[PDB]
């Protein structure tokens, strides 16, 4: 499913992301924009043989099991395929754990490079939240 911007903001608000660990909702919408273009089915293979999955591009080295990433952790205890669902619950639950881990949202390269220090509120502007 390819979400709308305000639709995504709304589903994220409902799953507790607005202000989770101090990151306003605009940050998470922005991250999703640039990580996956709001598409829950997005996959990107990394050079280390790991794969990023879903709306927030959660990585198979650490966070989810995809069966083809040698000696990987499954820190979110999910098959990575569960991250590609139209229901964003599993992605949101795994992300809350990632962002608690110490790097905060710096764990997402697109956020660090494209959202951090920008006016992230723009991404929720005009949405009935
Ligand atoms: Cl915001
Ligand atoms: Cl932080």
Swiss-Prot record:
Cystine residue pairs: 6-127, 30-115, 64-80, 76-94
UniProt EC number: 3.2.1.17
GO MF: beta-N-acetylglucosaminidase activity; identical protein binding; lysozyme activity
Tissue-wise expression: In the egg white and polymorphonuclear leukocytes.
C-type lysozyme domain ranges (all copies): 1-129
Keywords recorded for this protein, A-Z: Allergen, Antimicrobial, Bacteriolytic enzyme, Disulfide bond, Glycosidase, Hydrolase, Secreted, Signal
Coiled coil: none
CC annotations in GO: cytoplasm; endoplasmic reticulum; extracellular space
Residues annotated as the enzyme's active site: 35, 52
An individual GO BP term: cell wall macromolecule catabolic process
Family the entry assigns: Belongs to the glycosyl hydrolase 22 family.
Protein role: Lysozymes have primarily a bacteriolytic function; those in tissues and body fluids are associated with the monocyte-macrophage system and enhance the activity of immunoagents. Has bacteriolytic activity against M.luteus.
PANTHER family attached to this UniProt entry: LYSOZYME C
Protein name: Lysozyme C
Organism: Gallus gallus
Gene name linked to the record: LYZ
């Amino acid at each position: 499913k390819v979400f709308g911007r305000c639709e995504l903001a709304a589903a994220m608000k409902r799953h507790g992301l607005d202000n989770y660990r101090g990151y306003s909702l605009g940050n998470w919408v922005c991250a999703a924009k640039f990580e996956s273009n709001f598409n829950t089915q997005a996959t990107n293979r990394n050079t280390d043989g790991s794969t990023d999955y879903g709306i927030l591009q959660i990585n198979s080295r650490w966070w989810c099991n995809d069966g083809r990433t040698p000696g990987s952790r499954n820190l979110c205890n999910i098959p990575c395929s569960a991250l590609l669902s139209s229901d964003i619950t599993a992605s949101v639950n795994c992300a809350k754990k990632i962002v608690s881990d110490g790097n905060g949202m710096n764990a997402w390269v697109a956020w660090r490079n494209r959202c951090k220090g920008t006016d992230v509120q723009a991404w929720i502007r005009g949405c009935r939240l």
